[PDB]
Amino acid sequence: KRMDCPALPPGWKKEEVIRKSGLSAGKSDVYYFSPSGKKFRSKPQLARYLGNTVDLSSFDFRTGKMMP
DNA sequence: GCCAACGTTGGC
DNA sequence: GCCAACGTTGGC
């Protein structure tokens, strides 16, 4: 399920999807959803949308935490 | 050797 | 044409 990510602005949720098939079966991808449902797949994609709203330079994309 | 990042595939 | 799932690799 999509769980709230406190490091990001209110309404931002993150979800982790285990791959089901193929040679990378078992690995996982992380996605974020904006307050309005829009899907982000990488830290630079989040960065382009959020801009000056929050400094994502210490943001660990995979876990959803600022790692100082 | 690993994986972030994002192109490509397959199904719709 | 859209998009979720998977392949792929340059940079580390």
The answer to whether A36 CB sits below 7 Å from nucleic acid chain C is no
> Which backbone phi and psi does A33 adopt, to 5 degrees?
-125, 130
CATH number at residue A65: 3.30.890.10
For residue A3 the two structure tokens come to: 């769980």
Domain range enclosing A66? 1-68
Query: A50: Cβ–Cβ under 8 A, 6 or more apart, which residues?
Result: A8, A9, A56
Distance CA A45, CA A64 (A): 14
- Resolution in angstroms comes to 2.2
- Strand A59-60 with A65-66, pairing: antiparallel
Residue that is written with structure tokens 């600022």 in the block? A66
Q: Which two tokens stand for residue A17?
A: 């999807």
Q: CB of residue A28 closer than 7 A to nucleic acid strand B?
A: no
Instruction: Say how many domains are in chain A.
Output: 1
Phi–psi pair at A48, nearest 5 degrees: -60, -35
HSE (side-chain half, CA atoms, 13 Å) at A62: 4
Contact predicate A7/A28, CB 8 Å = no
Sequence letter at residue A4: D
In Å, what is the separation between the CA of A14 and the C1' of C11?
A: 26
The H-or-E segment that residue A49 falls in is helix A43-50
Residue A19 zone, left/alpha/beta (φ > 0; ψ -120 to 50; rest)? beta
- Name the experimental technique: X-ray
Quickly give A37 CA vs C12 C1' distance in Å: 33
Chain C footprint bases within 7 A of protein beta carbons: 4-8
